[PDB]
Structures are given as C-alpha cells and as structure tokens.
C-alpha cells in the first residue's frame, strides 16, 4: 500500500456494498433491470425475497405502485415466461392467484445470444442465401416477445417466397425440438402440480380399505408418478407438427397455437458441448470430432439435466431416491433411440475426417476405423462410452456428469490457486480421510507449503476440517485434526460464487451505461447509427469506442462465466 485507503475509498472503488446480497437475488434483479425496467426488477426482487406472493401482498410490500402498475408489470413478466402463477381456492370459496418466480425466463434472459448462436450452428442448412438472417430474426423475435403465434408473425410479411421460407424454417426448428408449444403446464410450479396429482390420486382410492396405509400412500404415489411422467414429457415428444397436409401435400407447423423457446433442449446441447470439451483433453482431436458426432446424433432424445421428479420434494424416502437413480440408469441404457452402432455414425461424418493413417495398431469412413475410434473412447478413464453389447454404445450421463463436475472443479481450483491446490484436492479426494502426516508422506512436497495451501483451501470450502478430541471436554488445544473433501458443499459454494461474479459484471455494465446516458442516447437513434463520424467531436469518438469496447469485454466474460456455471447445475 503506497497510501492508506480510508473506508470511503473502500466503499467507492472496491465492490463491498455488493458482497452483502445473495447471489441469486442479485443476479435475478440485475438481469431483469438490465433487460426490462425497474418495476419488473422490484416485483421480481420482492417475489424472490418473500417467496410466494399475491397481488394484494405485492401492493402492500412494494412502495410506489398502485394496483394498475403492478398488474401491468405482472402481465409484462408473464408474457416473458418470468413469473409462474397458481390459482388457489380456500374453504370460503374466495379464489386468489398466487405468483412465483421461475428459473426458465431468467435463464432465457441470460442465454439469449448463446441460444441464437447455438441455433445458427444447429440449423445445418447447406447453401443458405437469406435463410441464416431469417432464422436469426425469428429466434430473436420469439425470445424477445416471450411467445408468439405463427399466424400473427406471418401477417407482418406479405411476399410469397419469404412466407414459404418462414413455413419451411419453422418446420425445421420444431422438428429437432427447439420451439415447443406452450400451455398452462409451463406456468404452474412442479411442486404444486405434483401435490395436486398426488392428492387427486390419493383421495380417489376407495375408502374403508382393509389394506395398509403406507402401501396405499405408495400406490397413489406410483400412479401420480406415472401420470407425472406422462404429463411432463407431453410437449417434448411432438405437439406442433402433428398436422399433415393442410393444402397441396405439405407439412406446416400448426397455424393455431403459439410457440415458445424450449430451454431444456438448449441445456442438453450445452451439456453435450461440455462433454466435447472434456473429451478434447484425454484422447484425440479427430476422435473429438467422432465423439461430437456421437453426441449430436443423440442430442434430442437425451434425458433431462434435472429430473422433474427430483424437484417434487420426494427425496426423503431413501427407497425412492434409489428408485430414481435406477430409473435414470434404466432410461440412459435402453432408451429406444440412444443406442447406435458404427453404421449409424457412418452416414454423418463430414468431408474432413481423413482416418487413412489415424491409428497405428503396431506397438473412407469405414466401419472398422469408426469402430476403433469408438473403442478407444470406450477404453478411456472417464466413462465416455459404455457397451451394453459389443458393437452398440451408450453414453452414461448418469456416471459421467459427476466426473465432469469433478474435473472442471479441479481445473478451476488449480488455475486460481495453483498446482498445489490440484495436488492437495486430488490427494484428499482419492483418500477418503487423512491427517496431516499421511499427506506429508504421500504427497511428496514440503511441509510448510502443504500447511499454507491447505489453509488457503479451507476459505473456499475445498476441505472440511474434522476434529477428534482427546479430552473429556472438547477443545482444539489438545486434539487431532483430519481433513476431508465434501463435494456437495464445494460445488454449491463455487456455483454461488460464479453467480455472484456474473451479477457483479452485469451490475458494472449497467452502471457504465447509466452514467454515460447522454452520448449513448445521442448516438442511439437511427439517423446517426452507422454514420457517427460526421457530427461527433474527436473526444466523443474515443468515449463511444471505450464504452463499446468495455461492453463487449463484459459480455464476453459473461459468456465465459456461463461456460463454467452451467456445469454445476447438473
């Protein structure tokens, strides 16, 4: 410190006012205030802070809003799929609508340009002259307006060829499952839906049963479970291109229903991308292309990132937890669409895989070569691929996502605290529980650096310190201390840390754009946009380029933070 800083300097320069807010609240509020206005931000803030709220409670809590402003804000939030609702009736018959917050709309606001980029990449249309611009604009219009009907969007264009291309491109986008029909299912909470289904299937059982209460509960639960599995996957399978041949023997998306962005398929794509990035580390570069093709062939039929049955509050029963794990292993192994052989992957390799001298067994997209690639995938340390039968392969999402979590966390902690952090973390993750001397014997490096690095790891919850007393009353003065690794605490802590960093970035960006509103407003409107040179002064050019450069860096770092934060949701 060249000169000591007063607490005024700490408050002004260093972000300390921002360290006292929850990462979830701070992230959601900054995102909503960045995209929508301040009223939506305040409504979402009180919704997250106090939980479930009704319209009267929202009027009472938030200061400065009447009922009309609150209802306008709620309509704006509800169009963008940002607030869920449930209509609840009491004993007196007074029906009231409670409002919640749902993750999906906020994540859409946080995944916008990435969704556009991924759908551009997954378009895969050869020789596009105007189609790319059209897909980009239809995706942007869908995300911005929350949900739209195809007929209402078609009326904005009058020419025939572009309307035909609208029809073809919407059919293409719905075919793989990126734009799905919306309904009241996406606006009711999963917990409330499961509670209603369970209660209806429990009250429906005939009374005066001479059969046991616990197994009656489990029977109603199983019927509610199978109906839950039927209802959640209903829009996922097919609900918008079911119509065939309206006129002239063509397939068109239904001109009666509104489409909405399907976020969970985009999560499937991002998990596939993370697996590709992991596979680019142990084995291969062309082999990475092979594993990428293998994932992209099976990206649509992939299981959920989080099982909706897991959020239903049914984890207290250990038997149901084991049943969920076994059902996951059931579906991931013998789904009728996730099993493939060499020949199925033969017809998808582009004209860039050579494979003439790709391998040396000694110490033209053929079946033997692709089989050898799939085998060297099958022999890797992490379970990238598994064989239910020699020749057919399935990717074990149930036994690879923890592995990807561990690898990403270890590389992050190594890049931010040094290779000593990797060494200690792996040493205390391999061994289940160690003292200090076992570390000093097994991990061959100096004593004081072990103590320093391990002390620094406690601050971010990489290791948990376990006390063992040697006295009648417990004390650390004469006790022996063991060191463990609890994966759950660490993963949660770094997830919230990355959420906080993302929200800090967006808050700084919002402050930068708010403080320099004059120049941005002067350059914003269309008659100068693109020809800023003639009217602006020399200093204004530097100021505008500085603002834009900082904005681009902020959003690029936000994308790079998402690339590490998506892994810890799984």
């Amino acid at each position: 410190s060249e000169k000591l800083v007063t607490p005024e300097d700490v408050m002004t320069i260093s972000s300390l006012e921002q360290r006292t807010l929850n990462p979830d609240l701070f992230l959601y509020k900054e995102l909503v205030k960045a995209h929508l206005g301040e009223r939506a931000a305040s409504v979402i803030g009180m919704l997250v802070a106090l939980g479930r709220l009704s319209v009267r409670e929202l009027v009472e809590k938030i200061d400065g809003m009447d009922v009309d402003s609150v209802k306008t804000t709620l309509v704006s939030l509800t169009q963008l799929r940002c607030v869920k609702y449930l209509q609840e009736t009491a004993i007196s018959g007074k029906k009231t609508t409670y409002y919640y917050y749902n993750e999906e709309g906020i994540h859409i606001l946080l995944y916008s340009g990435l969704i556009i980029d991924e759908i551009i990449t997954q378009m895969r249309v050869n020789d596009e002259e105007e189609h790319k611009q059209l897909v980009a604009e239809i995706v942007q219009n869908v995300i911005s307006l929350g949900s739209l009907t195809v007929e209402d969007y078609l009326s904005s264009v009058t020419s025939d060829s572009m309307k035909y291309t609208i029809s073809s491109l919407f059919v293409q986008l719905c075919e793989m499952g990126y734009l799905i029909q919306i309904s009241k299912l996406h606006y009711t909470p999963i917990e409330d839906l499961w509670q209603f289904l369970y209660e209806k299937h429990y009250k429906n059982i005939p009374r005066n049963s001479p059969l046991s209460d616990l197994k009656k509960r489990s029977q109603a639960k199983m019927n509610a479970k199978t109906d839950f599995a039927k209802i959640i996957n209903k829009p996922n399978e097919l609900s918008q291109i079911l119509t065939v041949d309206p006129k002239t023997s063509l397939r068109i998306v239904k001109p009666t229903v509104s489409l909405t962005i399907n976020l969970d398929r985009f999560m499937k794509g991002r998990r596939s991308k993370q697996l590709i990035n992991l596979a680019k580390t142990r084995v291969g570069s062309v082999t990475a292309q092979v594993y990428k093709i293998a994932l992209r062939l099976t990206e649509q039929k992939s299981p959920k990132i989080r099982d909706p049955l897991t959020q239903t509050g049914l984890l207290q029963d250990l038997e149901e937890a084991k049943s969920f794990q076994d059902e996951a292993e059931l579906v991931e192994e013998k789904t009728p669409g996730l099993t493939f052989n060499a020949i199925d992957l033969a017809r998808h390799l582009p004209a860039e895989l050579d494979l003439r001298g790709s391998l040396l067994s000694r110490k033209p997209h053929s079946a033997s070569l692709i089989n050898s690639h799939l085998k060297i995938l099958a022999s890797s340390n992490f379970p990238f691929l598994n064989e239910t039968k020699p020749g057919v392969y399935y990717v074990p999402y149930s036994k690879l996502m923890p592995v990807l979590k561990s690898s990403v966390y270890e590389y992050v902690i190594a890049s931010t605290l040094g290779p000593s952090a990797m060494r200690l973390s792996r040493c205390i993750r391999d061994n289940k529980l160690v003292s200090e001397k076992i570390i000093n014997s097994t991990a061959l490096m100096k004593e004081k650096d072990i103590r320093s690095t391990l002390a620094s790891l406690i601050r971010y919850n990489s290791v948990e310190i376990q006390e063992v007393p040697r006295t009648a009353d417990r004390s650390a003065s004469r006790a022996v201390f063991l060191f463990r690794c609890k994966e759950t605490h660490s993963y949660n802590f770094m997830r919230q840390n990355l959420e906080w960093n993302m929200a800090n970035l967006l808050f700084k960006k919002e402050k930068l754009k708010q403080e320099n509103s004059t120049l941005l407003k002067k350059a914003n409107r269309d008659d100068v946009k693109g020809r800023e040179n003639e009217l602006l002064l020399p200093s204004e050019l530097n100021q505008l380029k500085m603002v834009n450069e900082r904005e681009l860096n902020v959003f690029a770092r936000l994308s790079r933070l998402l690339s590490l934060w998506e892994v810890f949701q799984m």
Partner: protein, 140 residues
C-alpha cells in the same frame, strides 16, 4: 525414505525424479515418445485400443536403475508412491494396480473455443480495467 535430505523433504530432486519418470511413461504410452506431439495436434497419431502400451512399476525400477540419476537404489514402493504423486497432479492415469499411462493434458501444458481445461494458453488482461473478474472477490 530417500526423499528426505538432512531430515527434510526437498522438492528439486523429487521434481527431477517426477520429470524423468513422466518422460519414460511418455516414451512408452504415446507413440514415438514426445516426438509425435511436437508441432500442431493435427498430425498426431495414437495407438489402437488393443495394445499393451502402459509401463508397470518394475519397468520404472529397471529404467531408473539403469539411468542411475537417483544416487540411492530405490524400492518398488517408492515407485508406487511417485506414480501416486503424478496421478494426483493429473500427470498420468491408473486403470489397474501398478499400471499407469501418461495423459494428454500434461502434454498440452508444456507447449479457439473457450475451455477451462486449457488455462495455460489465454493471458491475464491488461491492467487498469474496472470490469476485471476476480475469483477472490466474493469471499474477502
């Protein structure tokens, strides 16, 4: 053991031992030793998944004893401990008891879409920027 010098564990001699054993495992597991991984990753060729390409602890014993760079005769238990140190630091990988192969992340650590896995490449930002991200910011 032989790691201690004057009653304290050293790091230079241990690092030399780890370097030579990792070089040997690189020579045996990936083809041509390090000679294929030179230049870009485009031209590298890997062995078929039906070969006995790993080296066991006895192979390390033989190679280091022939080299005589460790100045005291060493035990297979020391070899197992050293390979455990390497597999801790993500230098090699174990599939079977006393069976190790060199990985590929370590090779890239010597000498495009963002991946956390290759953190050695991309540089820290130029100073005097107010939108710099610190992992240490939230806790303290």
């Amino acid at each position: 053991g032989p790691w201690f010098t004057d009653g304290e564990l050293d790091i230079e001699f241990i690092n030399s031992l780890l370097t030579i054993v990792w070089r040997f495992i690189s020579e045996n597991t990936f083809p041509n030793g390090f000679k294929n991984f030179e230049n870009g990753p485009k031209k590298n060729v890997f062995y078929a998944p039906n070969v006995k390409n790993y080296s066991t602890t006895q192979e390390i014993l033989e190679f280091i004893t022939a080299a005589q760079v460790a100045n005291v005769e060493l035990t297979p238990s020391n070899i197992r401990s050293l390979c455990e140190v390497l597999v801790y630091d993500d230098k090699l990988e174990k599939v079977t008891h006393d069976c190790y192969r060199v990985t590929l992340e370590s090779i890239l650590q010597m000498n495009e879409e963002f991946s956390i896995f290759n953190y050695f490449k991309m540089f820290p930002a130029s100073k005097h920027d107010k939108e710099v991200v610190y992992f240490d910011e939230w806790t303290i």
